């Protein structure tokens, strides 16, 4: 799809609630549309609409981004913000995600052709169209672990990549000046306000993200096009076993990860693979010595799980 | 086999007991033939069952999934997590275990083959859908924070990509981890499960326990399992054309000796058979050739003596 | 007062909201009754109910265990965890905490008997069996590792004697921290309750949360309660003969400023307010002795000039 | 009471199980009698039997010892080992624990007094039955956070004070040659014979102290003498509530504890202080409302808590 509503609703089949988060980066996709459709030199004065995402962890940040960038069919990188202030003689210098991003349309190109030139493709692809995600970008703005760049040097080294730049890879110069940038942090332990005043005006569009509620768990559950229900009842499906949830063994799942999310850690929606593969286990390792059968999971089921 | 209950019948060939651990391994490797049965996006949003095993040192966590992927034949790299803290040119990044893998699923596709440029292809389709990754003391790069490279979360961080899914260059090309399974192992002592980042607990689905090895575990690790050291040293020895024989009570009173010492110097669990057989044996390993024909029985009282 | 639903109505004069809050040191408090209640050897066994505070900075965590040592006349110590873990001279020991006190305890002593060595041995018994102290940023000492001083696990076990039970010398004589409460107190962002040491663990039996504030709460903040800054800053300008006035809708305006600030720059809880009353003030503090005998209204149009 | 078996029997009153570790303190306490038996130079030729001992945290290594020393009447002083090993003008050196320990028997001469001379009998009992708890003594013998004196040389500095050495204080001079020294450690950042020497040749006993079981959390809870049953039935006794405690309530109560240990982290019993406490929060509160009432907790309160 190509249209900001249409892009919230492509979204809304992966990710449950965040529809201030859905809306961002459908402007700052949009908005790489209406830079193409314009023609003469505005067309090289108009910069990626780079977003700063603040929410705590584990409630849809990086699965936006990357469900997002799929639906555009951008090449997409993942990078955690401090690894560059680490020492280390591989890959501890910020062009490293370029370079990656590069690999990964080269690899992206490969796919799209067969459904010298394809080299040249990922590296048109990589400067129109990549997409950045720098997580805990709120790491690297703290009062200042690692024995490396300094946090704000890693702020320092960012910038060329996102006011624009060229970098040298195993294929030829990549320029940086339409990549579309996605940062993320809980700010916490910074503000956004502590970002360099070159990285502040290089990130236009904010947005926040909310916790996720008891009832975004269950939707999360069962939902989604890829929900964890749907793939356990498709992995058991290859053993010829029908396995049926309850919607109170649903609740009663969802319930297992908001308590322990509130006595242990609260890491958001990444308790709910953990929490159902432990209820799953006598049946997943029984399954084929159960072929033809019906499974159902209630309440009772996942209590004594 | 391709069975849970058969995999862990594979495995009880060579590994006593950890019933729980062999199931979890089990589970995970069957989720893999689950997967690709799939067709469709679903082939695509499945991801492997990756685990985090708990238990003393020297008791089978590294032998399970060592056995596993050779029940699979699967390529399989063992690597030691707090190798990436300390400082050093060669080998100090994570991607090296990327790159170690492909160089073991090439040199596995060869053999079978025999018995080129289309298997290179295939090293890096088998590691990229069969790779199996063990990381050996996950628990102490998540502790407080003596290595001077890379900080304990910092390794940390640097393993997100690899569990999460990440294209890894290599000297054959770019490989993907997605559907590589880790393995994941510590004692958790100096720390404890939920102090690793919360992104690595997202992408570890199955938590199993292993246990202290008992006494009897001694005596049926070392004459039980198929590779069993008694088996060896018996092997070894009829090559000298020697009969190397051991009582039940010698194999009781070298148990005891293992259990003696990891309760007074310290507990390595079954890496002490190791070294204790093999001090039995050093009157005999050495004058076996000029013993050709004859039967060498070990009893408890030569356990004493030895 | 001394019962716990009159210790949340006193607590309700003072602090708006966080109910659960009040009502967990009404229990600490109450037990403290309880056990000199209590005769013979279950007097000396049963030790204070201290405290877990979890929370967002500024909404109430030091103001309701300051207006409970005060309704309890009870002598209060606040501390900041981190400071023990710089380096100096002076002050850097957490027995400077007890010592600290005491010197509260005796110039307590002595403006209630007003209303001597025997005022000494009193505030020494009143430290020993009434004793509060808070401390703030318990959960920064115990994450995962500026200071140069002390390690934030050392400040952790340098607290583990005065919360078990320890005596500690001053310049008035020896003192036992067994029956003193604490109340401790973090956002944990940083780490997470159980980072703390299983031994501080132990010594902290009750888990209590605190929640963020809304803007409703910031109305009620600003006039409801009996020290409030609207009562403060009316009864300021009552000594020039000038009637300060506020509308309800200079009231709303001004709670939604502090709200933006903290929405936009950071959220520092009610210690917004403060600032923000002051800089609409600035015309009138200024001009209120050249005004008496006037009375002067701030509306919601004055606010939006200021 | 004097006699081992005796010991071990008040010993009985406070603590669940252990039984070796309690034999080993009572032998420890039974030889000082033994030496005061003795007449002559073999009077000044043996030494304290001290302790080492082994075991996981919060099983009662500190109970057995805390509560041994008060059966003798001994002044008894509990100390961190890593305390000496950061940086600080104030009490981080290892004649503190002497010096406390004399204050700690002033403080308990007055009290048997009453019931200048006073001084020199708390100098005199500190010589003589002063009994001394170093905690984690395994973590000063490691692989080397503390950036004060280095773990190898806080073994170093126990040295004097167990071989034996005279000690300064506020009020004289403090021999600690016949002091009883008992230590402690879980023993998996370090073994045993990592021990300096010296010290190992001063811990002639050396004693093993297991996990606690589901059973021993039961046994804890409502059998021992100060047990935190007792001490929640006392207290609302005096609000004039009668709390009684059903069996199966009990076993509840264990059982959140054990899974909690299980979970997030095992600190043995030192779970229950915290698991007892908010299931009585509700009643707790209401107390002075209720009085005059019984009030029986069972397993559904304790579940619903
Ligand atoms: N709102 C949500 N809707 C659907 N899935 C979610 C949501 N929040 C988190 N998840 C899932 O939880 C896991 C972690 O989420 P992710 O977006 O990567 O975390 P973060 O915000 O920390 O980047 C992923 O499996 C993701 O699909
Ligand atoms: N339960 C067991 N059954 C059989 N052999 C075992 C067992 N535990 C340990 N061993 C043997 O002891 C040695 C060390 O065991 P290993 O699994 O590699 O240790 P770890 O669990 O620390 O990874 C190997 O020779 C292994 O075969
Ligand atoms: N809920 C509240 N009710 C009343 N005053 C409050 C509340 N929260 C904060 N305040 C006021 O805001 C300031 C800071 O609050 P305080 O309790 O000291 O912060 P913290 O919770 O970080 O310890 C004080 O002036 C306090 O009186
Ligand atoms: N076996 C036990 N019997 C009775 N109480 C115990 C036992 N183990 C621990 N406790 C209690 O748990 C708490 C911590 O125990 P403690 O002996 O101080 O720990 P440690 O072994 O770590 O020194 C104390 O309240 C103690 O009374």
């Not at 509503?5 to 809304?12: A, G, H, N, Q, T």
């Not at 499906?237 to 999310?261: G, H, P, Q, R």
């Amino acid at each position: 799809n190509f249209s900001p509503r249409e892009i919230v609703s492509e979204l809304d089949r992966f990710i449950i609630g965040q529809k201030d988060a859905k809306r961002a980066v459908a402007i700052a996709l949009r908005n790489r549309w209406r830079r193409q459709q314009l023609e003469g030199q505005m067309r090289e004065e108009v910069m990626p609409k780079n977003i700063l995402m603040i929410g705590p962890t584990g409630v849809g940040k990086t699965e936006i981004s990357r469900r997002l960038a799929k639906l555009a069919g951008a090449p997409f990188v993942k990078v955690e913000a401090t690894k560059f202030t680490e020492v280390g003689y591989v890959g501890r210098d910020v062009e490293q995600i370029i370079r990656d991003l590069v690999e990964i349309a080269i690899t992206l190109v490969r796919e799209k052709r067969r459904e010298d030139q394809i080299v040249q493709e990922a590296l048109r692809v990589s400067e129109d169209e990549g997409i950045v995600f720098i997580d805990e970008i709120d790491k690297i703005a703290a009062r200042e672990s690692g024995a490396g760049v300094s946090r704000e040097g890693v702020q320092r080294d960012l910038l060329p990549l996102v006011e624009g730049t060229t970098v040298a890879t195993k294929y030829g110069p990549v320029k940086t000046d339409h990549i579309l940038f996605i940062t993320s942090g809980a700010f916490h332990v910074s503000k956004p306000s502590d970002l360099l005043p070159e990285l502040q005006g290089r990130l236009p569009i904010r947005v926040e993200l909310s916790a996720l509620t008891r009832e975004d768990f269950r939707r999360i559950l069962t939902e989604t096009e890829a929900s964890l229900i749907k793939q356990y009842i498709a992995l058991m499906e290859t053993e010829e076993v029908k396995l049926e949830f309850s919607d109170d063994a649903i609740d009663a799942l969802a319930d297992i990860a908001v308590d322990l999310n509130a006595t242990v850690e609260n890491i958001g929606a990444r308790r709910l693979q953990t929490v159902i593969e432990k209820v799953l286990d006598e049946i997943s390792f029984t399954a084929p010595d159960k072929a033809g059968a019906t499974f159902i999971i209630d309440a009772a089921y996942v209590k004594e799980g």
